[PDB]
Amino acid sequence: GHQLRLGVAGLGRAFTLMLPTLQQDPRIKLVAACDPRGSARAQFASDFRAPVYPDIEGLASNPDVEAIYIASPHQFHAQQARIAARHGKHVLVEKPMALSLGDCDEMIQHCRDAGVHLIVGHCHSFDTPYLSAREIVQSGELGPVRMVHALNYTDFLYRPRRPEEEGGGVVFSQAAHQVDIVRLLVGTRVRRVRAITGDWDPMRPTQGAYSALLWFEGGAFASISYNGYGHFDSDEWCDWIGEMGGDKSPIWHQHFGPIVVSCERGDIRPLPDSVCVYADLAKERRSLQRPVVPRFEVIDELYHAVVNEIKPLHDGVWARATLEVCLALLDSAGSGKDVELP
C-alpha cells in the first residue's frame, strides 16, 4: 500500500549497495528474503525480524510480499522473475536484467501475463542529474540531440563489485550504465554500433576498456569510452564527486563519469551536484537538490508503478534494449565489424 512490502531474493553485493536506499526510503518495508546461504538468511532474519527462505518459491509464496527485488546472480534472474510473476509479485531485478535476449523476452512475457510490473534494478540512468538533463532535451529548449560524448575512467577491474567479472565483464556491468544514460538522453533507437575493446592485463584476462560509436535513429551519434584499469580517475571532471555521491579531495547525486550532450542549440553537462547548460545566450550552472535518500529515483519508479500504475521508464523492454546494445558492442569488438540493430 503506502509502505511497499518488499521481499529480497539474493542478499549479495547488489543488495548491500541498495540497502541504505531500502532502509532510508519511508515507502519501503523489507518483509522477507531468500538466499541459499544460511549466514545471509540468518543476518536478514536478525536485522529485519523477518521470515527467510532458502529459495524463491518460499519468498514468492509469502502473501505479505507485494514486490520482489531480485539481486541474485544473473543466471537465476529469468527463473526468479518467472516464479515471482506466477505468484502475482511485482519485480525489481538488478542490472543486468539477464545476459541473453531470450531470458529477457521470457521475463517480459511472464510479467506481462501475470499483470505485474517489471523494473530493472539500479541503473545510473535513474540518477537525478540525467533525468533532469533528459527533461531539458524533451522540453525542446535546446532542440534535438545531435551528439553525445561519454567517458568513464575507473578502477573497476581491480576494485570492483566482484561477481560481475562469460567473457565481457566491463561491457555487461559498466557499458550497461553508459549505454543506458546515452539512450535516456538521446531518446531514440540505437541503429548501429562499432566497438573496440582493450585487454592488456594478463592477470585480468577480460576486456578492461573500450571505445564505441553509436548511430541513433534521427542522425544523432554518440561516442562512449570506458577504461577500468584504475589509473586516471575521471571523477576529477565531475567536480571530484565519486560514483556513489561521495566527496573526493550529506551526499550528492550518483553519476557514471563525464558526459556532454550536444543539442542543436547547446550542450548539457549533467553533474552530481548540478546541470550545466551552455547555450549561445547564457552559460548556466542549474542547481540540483541534494538527495535525502540515495537512489530514491529507483523507488519512485517502483512505488509509482505498483501503487499508482504509472508505466515506469526503466521497464523490461527498456533494459532488454540496453542489453541488446551491450551484446552488439561485444560482437562488434569480437568480430571487427559493425552490428546493425533491428
Ligand X SMILES: NC(=O)c1ccc[n+]([C@@H]2O[C@H](COP(=O)([O-])OP(=O)(O)OC[C@H]3O[C@@H](n4cnc5c(N)ncnc54)[C@H](O)[C@@H]3O)[C@@H](O)[C@H]2O)c1
Ligand Y SMILES: O=C(O)c1cccc(O)c1
Amino acid at 215: W
Binding to ligand Y by CB under 6 A, coded x per residue (else -) over 17-36, reads x-------------------
| Residue 277 phi, psi dihedral angles, 5° rounding | -120, 125
Q: Which does 196 bind (CB under 5 to 8 A by kind): ligand X, a second copy, ligand Y, none?
A: a second copy
Helix axes 101-114, 77-86, angle to 10 degrees: 10
Q: Which does 237 bind (CB under 5 to 8 A by kind): ligand Y, a second copy, ligand X, none?
A: a second copy
Helix axes 316-335, 176-186, angle to 10 degrees: 120
Q: How far is the CB of 62 from ligand Y (least distance, A)?
A: 25
**Grid coordinates representing 287?**
542547481
Binding to ligand Y by CB under 6 A, coded x per residue (else -) over 207-246, reads ----------------------------------------
The residue count for binding ligand Y (CB under 6 A) is 8
The residue count for binding ligand X (CB under 6 A) is 23
Euclidean distance between CA atoms 160 and 69, whole angstroms: 22
Binders of a second copy in range 210-229 (CB under 8 A): 211, 213, 215, 221-223, 225, 227, 229
Cis bond upstream, residue 63 (ω within 30): no
Q: Which does 278 bind (CB under 5 to 8 A by kind): ligand Y, ligand X, a second copy, none?
A: a second copy
Binders of ligand Y in range 159-188 (CB under 6 A): 161, 164, 173-174
The residue count for binding a second copy (CB under 8 A) is 35
Euclidean distance between CA atoms 232 and 206, whole angstroms: 19
Identify the CA nearest to 341 among candidates 199, 198, 193, 137. 193
Q: How far is the CB of 96 from ligand X (least distance, A)?
A: 5
Q: How far is the CB of 309 from ligand Y (least distance, A)?
A: 25
Residues 4 and 303 sit within 8 Å (Cβ to Cβ): yes
**Across the beta sheet with 209-216, what order do the strands follow?**
283-287, 274-279, 266-271, 259-263, 145-153, 221-227, 209-216, 190-198, 339-340
Chain residues that interact with ligand Y, rule: CB under 6 A: 14, 17, 95, 122, 161, 164, 173-174
Chain residues that interact with a second copy, rule: CB under 8 A: 146-147, 149, 151, 153, 194, 196, 198, 200-201, 209, 211, 213, 215, 221-223, 225, 227, 229-233, 237, 260, 262, 264, 266-267, 269, 276, 278-280
